[PDB]
Every structure is written in C-alpha cells, then in structure tokens.
RNA sequence: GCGAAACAGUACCGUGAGGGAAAGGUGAAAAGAACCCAGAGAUGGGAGUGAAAUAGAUUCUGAAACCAUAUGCCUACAACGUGUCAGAGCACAUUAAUGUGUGAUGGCGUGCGUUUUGAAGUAUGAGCCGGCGAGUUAUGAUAGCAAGCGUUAGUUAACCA
RNA sequence: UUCUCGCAGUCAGACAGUGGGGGAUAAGCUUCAUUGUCAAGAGGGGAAGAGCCCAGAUCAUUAAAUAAGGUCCCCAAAAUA
RNA sequence: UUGUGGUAGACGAGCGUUGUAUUGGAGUUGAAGUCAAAGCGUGAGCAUUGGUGGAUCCAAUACAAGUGAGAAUGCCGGCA
C-alpha cells in the first residue's frame, strides 16, 4: 500500500522552476513502482449470505432434474465389495457398461474402503460422500452410483 | 538566441547536402607506377621531372 | 443445464464506473460539479456538516 | 439510340449495351424488367415521359459503395460517435428498349 | 554478386561518414580507391581498408570476374552511441553521447539485382495469393 | 491481479495508423499527429459529402448558362420556358451532356421555340 | 447519382484573335476579353483546364474612357519602400503605358487562381500594330 | 513480483543520520566458428560442424519511432494546419474491386485536451516512439431490479463436524 | 404542464432588439425586465463577422422547389420600361 | 407520426482480453506475436492469406478485473 514505501519521501525538485512535474510523494500510483491504494486486497469476504429453504429447493430440484434422466443407475453395496484396489476391475466393470463415457462420481455413506482405495489414478472417477456433494459436484458427474441404501433414506430426508 | 521547433527531415536533408564535397586533383605518374594527384608528390621519389626525394 | 454452457435469468444489471474513457459517455465526473469542495475526491457533505 | 432513367430522384442518359450503377431497389439479379419511368429513348420525347415506350433491363450485380465513415466528433466537448453508411447499389444495363 | 562487408560499429558519425560514404558510390573498382587514396579526411585509411578487404573477398571466395565491379552501395546505419558526461561551469554535468556507425559496403557486378528483389517480392505476394485462392476454393 | 493485455494496445494504434499513408513528412508516421489528421480528413470529407452536389448544380449553372450564350439567349428565360410550359424531367447535367451531343441539344432548342 | 460528365483528355489548344481599341470602354472590352482568354462561353471549360486561346490588342493608344474620370478616378499601386505609391489618373495614362492599365484591369477580374498568372499571359496588347503575331496567322474579330 | 531472479542493499552519493540504482534467457547437445584471403588485429569474407549460421558467445523472439538506399510519381515562377473532394499524367493487376501505387491542375478547408461567457490563437501542455499508468474494498443504511419463502411468519451470529 | 423515487449538473454569463437605473440617454460599461441566439446547435449570406439576419444537420446522393440574399467580372443567376 | 443539433447531465444496449469452470479444437505435414495486403464489420472487433521464429493458443457459455491510454509543465526507457 501507498504507506510501505521505503525512505523518506522529501523532494529532490524544487516547489518552483522546474519544467517536469513536482511530485512531492516519490513512490505515486503513477510513478513507477509503489504507491498502491486500492490494487489487490486479500480483504475479500468471500461471502454471499444464502438461504436455507432456497437452498433445499435448489437441491430437490436437481435430485428432479436427475431423477427423471437418471443418467446413472442404482448400485448395491455387494457390488462395493469382493473388489480390490486395482483399478483394473474397476475399469474392466466401466467399459462393461461403457462407462468411461461420463466423469462419474461415488456418493459414498457406509465407508466401504473396497471400493474407496481404486478411483484414485484415472481423475475421469471419484469418490465422495454424499451429503458432501453440490450441484456443481452434481452436474459435472452426469453420473453417479447410487447407493442401495440411500434410496428411501435419501426419499426421506428429501 | 533560441530556435523554435527541431529541423524537418527534409529541410535536414537540403541543408546537408550543401556539404556535397568536389573531387581531389588528378595526375598519372611516368615514372612511377602510381596515381599521383596534379601539382602534388607521387611516392616514388620524383615530383615529376627528376628524382627529387626519397621513395617513401 | 450443463457444465459447458448457463445463461442468466436478467443478472448482472448495469452498472456505473468512473474515470474509464470519454467517448463511454458521462465519464470521469458524470456529475461531480465544477470547482467545488465536493467536487473533490472524498469531498462530500458530512452528516454532522 | 440512348434512354434517360429516373432512378428515385437521380436521372441517368444511359446508351445501349452500358453497364451502370444506380440506387439498390430490390431488383431481381441477372433477370429482365420492363422499366416505364424512362424518357428520351432516340429523338423520341414525351411530355410527363415517354408514353408506349418502356425500357428492357438486364441487372447484373447487386452491391454497396464504400463504407461511408460517418463521425460525429466535437472539438473540446467530448461528443464523438462512429457509424459506416455502405448505401448499396444495383449495377444494370439496357439491352433491347421498346417502343 | 553482392561482397557485402560489414564494420559493425566504428566511432563515425553517421553525418561524417555519410558524406564520403555516398561521394564514393557510382564509380568502378579501381576510380574509386585511387580517388580515396587522394583525400585528406580521417573516415579514408579505414574505409580503403575495408574495401580492400571486401576486393579480395570478392575475388577469392567466389571468384568474380574482378574488373566490371563498381561502388554498388555505401551506408552508414545506426551504429550504438556512447552516453558519457562533460562538466560545465557553476558545478553542472551535460550528457555527451559518442557517435558510431554500422558501417557496410556493398558491390555489384552486373547491372541487376535491382529488379531480382522485385522479382522475389512478386512471387512472395504470388504465392500469398495462391494461399488465400485455394482457402477461396475447395467451398 | 495483474492482466496481460500488453499487445491489443498496439494492435489498436496500429489499426488507427493504417489509414494515414500518403501524407506529407512526418504525418502519417507518429500516432496522435495521425489521429488528429484522421479527423481533420474526416471533417473534409464530412463537407465535401454536404455540399459537392451544390457545388456541382452551380456549376452546371455556369455552364449550361454559358452555352445558353453560346446560343444567344440567357439562362433565366430558358429555365421559365421549360417550367412554364411542356415541362419535362431532363436534367442539369443530362442537358450538359446533351450538349455535348452535337444537334442534339438544338433539337430541344428548336423543340422548346415550338 | 454520378454519370461521370466528361472532359478533354488535355487536349486545350488556343488560337490567335485580333481587336483593335478605338471607341472601347475599359470594363466593357474587359468582361468580353476575360471570357475569350477564360473559355469561359465553351461548355468543356473547367477551372483546371481554362480552355481560352490567345488575344492581340492592336493599337492600344485609341482607347476612350467616359465622364470625368480620366481627371477624377486614380490608380494607386505602392512599390516596396514608403512612397513608392505611384497614383496615376486616367489622363495620365491616356499619355502613359495605357496597355500595361489594359493588363492589370483585366487581371485583376482574372480568377483568384496559381494559372491566372498563365492566362494573363495569353493578351499581348500593342499601342501599335507590328509583331510577329501577325504570322501566327490570327482569327480577326470584333469586341473579343 | 521483497528494493533485491545477477554476488543488491551492490555500485554510487555524503563526514553522518540517511539513502540508493541498471542489468535473466545461445543452441538439443558448443555440436563455439578446424583450415584459408586482406590487414596490425579484432573482424569480415569464404569454408566446416551441427536439421537449423535470425543458430555466431550481440546469441528465446526481435515492435514502434528513427536512420538511410533505390524501383515507379512528380516537384527549381511559387503565398499553402500541407489535407479533402474532383483529376491529368505516369506505372501496374488484386484480399475483382466501376482496382491499386503517385497525384499537373480546380474547389473547399484558421490543430487538439484544458478551464474558460468566450481562442485556430501570441492562454494552456505536449521532441517523438514505446512500457506502466490514476473511481477499489470491508462493514452498515436506503431506492430500484431479480429470486426464494411467505403468514405464529423469514432468519442466524458466535460458532462446532 | 400534476405527483412519487433516484441521479443530477448550473452559476464568473455573454450578444443584439425593446424598458431602463447610473453615467454624459459614453461604452465592446455595470446592473436588472422581455424577446431571440450561443453557451448546450452546425449550416446560407454579407470580406471574415461566437450571440447580426435566414433557417434548425439521420446517412449516401453529379435531383426539384425555395428563405435571407443575389444576378458585369472575379465567384452564381435580367433586362424591359 | 415524431423522429436523429446536442456539452453538461440522466438512462440503455453491446465488444475485446486474462484466469476458472466444462464442451470442442489446432498444433514441427508448424501455435502465438509481428509485419505486408487491393477484406469483413455498424463503432467497439472478427478475420484470411503470406512472410519471420519455432511452441503455445483459438473458439461456445457464465463468473471474477491492478479490464480498456493523448496529452496528465504524466513516470521509465530509447531515439532525435
């Protein structure tokens, strides 16, 4: 900012005969380097209050807007299991549906770590919890495996 | 004793090429191989008639 | 919509800048009078003034 | 021998086989029209115009003159707007005027 | 050919040298070094040098045929300027700037290579064209 | 944050340049001097566009006039007499270049006695 | 809009006219005389072309002014120093270089033009009759 | 961007508090110019290597202004903010366009931004080119606009995961 | 043209006609009143004529009709009595 | 039909670039910059071809700006 200039800003000019402009403060915002009033601030706050009830709209409304597509399909939590880390099952069931195709994300709720230890190299799948997802998340996965479980309970919770 | 404005280009030019020079005196030496220049010394030790100096 | 495209729904109204061009129209003063007191930067009426 | 066309306002004593340019009107490119605001066709003249006598155009492009630079700038007042006028035209010749 | 030879940044003027350098453009190859062997100016020795050199170049690296050359072009381009100072009275300093010149000779053989460039220039914008043509077509 | 936008600069007084070519010395050559002859060309055009078909009408006064008393009568009584009477809607310059048509002008001349 | 109204393709070419000035009034030979040397009657002439031909004023010493003004109007023109206004009457100039007033009236109706110095040039005035000009075979005419 | 990409708080200024600068980029690997012509040599020119000698230690690239050179245009009788609209003539064919390069001659034509009631002004400021360059935010109030909820209604801060 | 909301800017006015006050019925005067102009709007004319007159500029136009005003020429249009 | 004289002053509609988001893409069989051109644009702009240099950049939609240069007797740099 224009109060972390270094010296003190006396003038090397006179108050009269000079020909180029006085320029009291050495460093100005338009003298070549320091002066800063405005510039970039990390003062941002980032912020911008929401609602709930909004918010729980926007959130039924996209669970609508993919419920009706659906995209994706239910998965059960059997499934989850009997697989390793590699991502080579993992893959192999993807191109056995075609899956490939979307940048799929796991919504995850019983922690399974089966399933969780693989979609770790290829970055087009991950995993994340389901009460951590966004429409951001959401729209961007155009795809997700659906838990067995969350159906009724996710129904429920709306 | 100040001028008002810098000299053009073009009126640069023009008082430049007041400064165009002429050419030097000519004169084919005789007894010396060279090029000489009228009413002047070759460098071969004649001025024109006779031997008058030294080679150099 | 998609992650590739979104359109607003009359966001993002007009707003008003100064100090950027004049030929922009109502530019650096846009009503900022002519030799005054409040014609200056940070010049305006106090509220205990 | 010749024939005088009232393009608008704008007259046009054009001769046979002369490709000109005139106003835009919509004119159908390259097709054939029966023109009747025509006088003045060879030693032939009419009073309001020429009367039984009509002209028979060809068209052969249809176009615009140069972007007129339209500015609008006022010195020390700062009101300066910039616009390019392209006033299209209609390039035409007569072939075959009847009378 | 061309005998392009190039001094790269002497201490000469440009306005200096300039004079000879252009009084010594449009004679032969021998009318012009014996009439710069005559002339009592210091941009002489070193400018003869050079063309000696350019000569012997000529005639060696390429083998022309040495006697129809002629001063085809002498130049004095921009060469780097010196920035120092020089002190003047009640305690002042004014900025002097050291002149240079990057100095070139160039000399031709046949009475060409006026008309080759412009021959290069035109298929230059022939095959500009060619390109935008061929963008044209191919619809 | 800092934006790099360092080059549509030039590409602006670039294209505010290529215009002026033509121009006397140094007038096409710096970027305000080329501005302020842009606009100066632009006011002369501007002018020229307003009033060259004025300019052209008078001219065609003068001359059509001139071989008005090259027939031995005035332009004055010529203009009432096609006003007047059997008023037709040749031309200014189309009756210039009918005059340029030897015998043919004098057609109208004749025709306008009549 | 345009029907491109032609020109002559440089081809001005002038003619020798003769006049002789007896009983001739200034201005009314002028007017006269600045049309011939103008083309100004001719429906080619443009103000850049000027296509006029060349006129000779034979005895210029018979020219007749009306009213006073040979003793009343004068003519001033001032040198490059002070006094150097010479202000000649008409009846001076009856017994001066009448011609040379023949020149300047005249030019001074000429267009305000850099090439009205090249048609001023086009009269050749005479007080007399001899000049090689009469073998240029002229066209002879009366108020010219 | 720390002044500070380099050996910068260096150089440098002063006696001293104190200040206080400029400067990075070879190429893929020097694969760095072996030999030769001139000179005193640098160097240039050849050559030779590496795809690449705008690839020479001047070394990522290489603008504007400026400086010159000449192809085609014209100018040494001519009172012009030097341009514009017409246009001769000269030389051409393209980002085909009633073309472009130049413009004998004609007509019209007193810069800009500034505060000024008011300058084309002898008011004002500008050597030019190029780089940077001067209405932001945090919180709060209000008016409009858009949206949600909406009648015991809407809403959290602090916060905790 | 009345009202609400928000944002204004303007102050150092000038010119000419008409009423003037002061002067000296001096202003290129100062001050106010009305009208019109410029400021805040260019253009045709008068030699140019910031405010004089005519008249209110979308643009292109080698079209017509006019207003002020003009018609020997410069530079455009008439002579009849 | 009014329309368009219009500074200040009030108001509106669009453009360009950087980065994110994704959708696409070009790229040593040649990215971008630059220059040249006898383009498109309604102004913001979009090009295209060609040249140089050889590796990044263009486009569709929203967001955010140390976002938009002529003077500042502007600052720096080079050249007069």
């Known amino acids: 900012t224009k109060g972390e200039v270094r010296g003190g800003g006396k003038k090397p000019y006179k108050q009269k005969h000079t020909g180029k402009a006085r320029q009291g403060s050495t460093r100005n915002p338009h003298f070549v380097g320091g002066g800063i009033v405005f510039g970039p601030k990390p003062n941002r706050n980032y912020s911008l209050k929401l609602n709930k009830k909004a918010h729980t709209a926007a959130l039924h409304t996209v669970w609508s807007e993919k419920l009706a597509s659906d995209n994706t399909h239910l998965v059960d939590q059997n499934l989850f299991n009997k697989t390793e880390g590699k991502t080579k099952v993992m893959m192999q069931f993807l191109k056995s549906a075609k899956l490939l195709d979307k940048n799929v994300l796991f919504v995850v709720n019983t922690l399974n770590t089966n399933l969780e230890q693989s979609t770790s190299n290829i970055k087009n799948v991950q995993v994340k919890h389901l009460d951590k997802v966004s429409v951001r998340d959401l729209m961007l996965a155009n795809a997700l495996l659906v838990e067995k479980e969350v159906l009724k309970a996710l129904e429920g919770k709306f | 004793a100040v001028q008002q404005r810098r000299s053009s280009k073009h009126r640069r030019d023009k008082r430049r090429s007041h400064d165009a020079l002429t050419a030097q005196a000519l004169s084919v030496c005789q007894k010396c191989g060279k090029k000489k220049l009228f009413h002047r010394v070759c460098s071969c030790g004649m001025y024109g008639d006779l031997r008058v100096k030294k080679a150099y | 919509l998609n992650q590739l495209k979104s359109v607003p729904k009359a966001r993002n109204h007009k707003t008003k800048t100064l100090g950027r061009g004049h030929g922009s129209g109502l530019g650096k003063t846009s009503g900022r009078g002519q030799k005054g007191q409040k014609a200056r930067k940070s010049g305006l009426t106090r509220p205990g003034f | 021998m010749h024939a005088i066309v009232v393009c608008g306002s704008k007259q046009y004593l054009v001769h046979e086989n002369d490709t000109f340019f005139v106003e835009k009107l919509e004119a159908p490119v390259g097709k054939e029209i029966q023109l009747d605001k025509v006088l003045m066709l060879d030693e032939k003249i009419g009073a309001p115009y020429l009367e039984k006598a009509r002209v028979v155009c060809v068209v052969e492009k249809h176009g615009l003159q140069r972007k007129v630079n339209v500015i609008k700038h006022i010195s020390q007042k700062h009101h300066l707007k910039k616009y390019g006028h392209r006033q299209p035209y209609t390039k035409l010749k007569v072939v075959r005027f009847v009378h | 050919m061309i005998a392009f030879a190039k001094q790269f940044r002497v201490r000469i003027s440009p306005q200096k040298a300039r004079l000879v350098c252009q009084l010594i453009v449009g004679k032969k190859t021998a009318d012009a070094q014996n009439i710069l062997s005559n002339t009592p100016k210091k941009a002489a020795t070193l400018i003869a040098k050079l063309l000696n050199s350019a000569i012997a170049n000529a005639t060696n690296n390429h083998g022309m045929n040495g006697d129809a050359l002629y001063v085809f072009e002498c130049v004095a381009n921009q060469g780097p300027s010196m920035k120092r100072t020089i002190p003047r009275a009640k305690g002042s300093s004014n900025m002097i700037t050291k002149r240079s010149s990057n100095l070139v000779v160039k000399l031709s053989d046949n009475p060409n290579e006026r008309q080759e460039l412009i021959k290069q220039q035109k298929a230059l914008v022939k095959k500009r064209v060619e390109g935008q043509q061929k963008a044209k077509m191919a619809r | ?114 | 809009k345009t029907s491109m109204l032609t020109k002559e393709q440089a081809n001005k070419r002038r003619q020798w006219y003769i006049v002789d000035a007896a009983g001739l009034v200034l201005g009314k030979l002028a007017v006269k005389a600045a049309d011939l040397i103008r083309g100004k009657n001719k429906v080619d002439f443009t103000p850049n072309q000027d296509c006029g031909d060349y006129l000779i004023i034979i005895n210029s010493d018979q020219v007749v002014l009306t009213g006073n003004k040979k003793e009343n109007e004068f003519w001033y023109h001032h040198s490059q120093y002070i006094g150097g206004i010479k202000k000649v009457s008409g009846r001076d100039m009856l017994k001066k270089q009448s011609d040379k007033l023949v020149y300047n009236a005249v030019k001074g109706m000429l267009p305000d033009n850099r090439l009205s110095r090249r048609w001023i040039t086009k009269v050749h005035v005479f007080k007399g009759d001899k000049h090689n000009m009469e073998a240029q075979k002229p066209t002879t005419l009366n108020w010219s």
């Open chain 6, 1 to 114: 944050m800092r934006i790099k936008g360092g080059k549509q600069t030039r590409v602006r007084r670039k294209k505010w340049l290529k215009q002026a070519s033509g121009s006397f010395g140094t007038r096409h050559a710096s970027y305000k001097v080329a501005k302020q002859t842009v606009i100066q060309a632009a006011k002369y055009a501007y002018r020229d566009r307003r009033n060259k078909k004025r300019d052209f009408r008078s001219l065609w006064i003068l001359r059509l006039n001139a071989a008005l008393r090259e027939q031995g009568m005035t332009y004055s009584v010529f203009i009432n007499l096609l006003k007047k009477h059997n008023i037709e809607i040749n031309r200014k310059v189309l009756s210039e270049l009918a005059i340029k048509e030897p015998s043919k002008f004098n057609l109208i001349v004749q025709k306008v006695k009549s």
